[PDB]
């Protein structure tokens, strides 16, 4: 169920500096190209090893779209202040998300084209790639502007065409890499969290992709009660971490068992204190 997205952001700040423009590209949730106007030399750059097969004209080409989007956001950012009657001494955020999802059969499932202002939905192209959905009164002015200029048929073109065309092209070059997984390594820690009681924490470390599942069971029923779970955290080296725990009556620890479910294990890990 491959996919491709481009997360774009332009933020304005008080001062003499023009707003910063940042664009990040993803193929199957993985970052592969990024562009920051704060760089010493603004340019789209490789964020995955496979993209280093692309020639200079590719980089020069995308970089130029980059340069164009910048003005487009700088200008659009200015039109928003007018719409909302805002002032000049603050900071505002305009974000964009656009892309296409493909099935395993390489067939296009859906196109995406939506924008947010100040982190709230502003305007979005509907699933028919023909009609718009405007969130507020401001959004209405943009909707009309785009309906009269016939913008939908042009983003639709990119989404059913260029987006599908190129995404396949990428998957072809980087499927070997993408498919790559990292089996989690697990262990259980003991902590004095009370007298008569205690805490066991099941650790899952260095696994990729992020998707994982941790369970606890006293030979039989999985302990959903009194179990603590943390959001999956990045270790900073590409892989991720996670842990789950449960209060456990002191001296009874070695009777509880932990299970780790991740797509990289020849089979789910099972361990105990």
């Amino acid at each position: 169920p491959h996919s491709m997205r481009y997360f774009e952001t332009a933020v304005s700040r008080p001062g003499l500096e023009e707003p910063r423009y940042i664009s990040v590209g993803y193929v199957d949730n993985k970052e592969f190209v990024r562009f920051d106007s704060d760089a010493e030399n603004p340019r789209y750059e490789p964020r995955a090893p496979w993209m280093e097969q692309e020639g200079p004209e590719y980089w020069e080409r995308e970089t130029q779209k980059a340069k164009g989007q910048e003005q487009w956001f700088r200008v659009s950012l200015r039109n928003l202040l007018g719409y909302y009657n805002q002032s000049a001494g603050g900071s505002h955020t305009l974000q964009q998300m656009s892309g296409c999802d493909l099935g395993s059969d390489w067939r296009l499932l859906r196109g995406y084209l939506q924008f947010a202002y100040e982190g709230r939905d502003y305007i979005a192209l509907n699933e028919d790639l023909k009609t718009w959905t405007a969130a507020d009164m401001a959004a209405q002015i943009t909707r009309r502007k785009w309906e009269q200029s016939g913008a939908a048929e042009h983003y639709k073109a990119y989404l059913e065409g260029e987006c599908v065309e190129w995404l396949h092209r990428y998957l072809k070059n980087g499927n070997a890499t993408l498919l790559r997984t990292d089996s989690p390594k697990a262990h259980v820690t003991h902590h004095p969290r009370s007298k008569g009681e205690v805490t066991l924490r099941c650790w899952a470390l260095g696994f990729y992709p992020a998707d994982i599942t941790l369970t606890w069971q006293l030979n039989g029923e999985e302990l959903t009660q009194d179990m603590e779970l943390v959001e999956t955290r990045p270790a900073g080296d590409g892989t991720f971490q996670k842990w789950a725990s449960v209060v456990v009556p002191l001296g009874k620890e070695q009777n509880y068992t932990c299970r780790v479910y991740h797509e990289g294990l020849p089979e789910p890990l099972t361990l105990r204190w």
Binding site: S23, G68, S76, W146, H154
Partner: peptide
């Protein structure tokens, strides 16, 4: 390949 916006907001 990145999108290229049309009409501004």
């Amino acid at each position: 390949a990145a999108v290229y916006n049309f009409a501004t907001m």
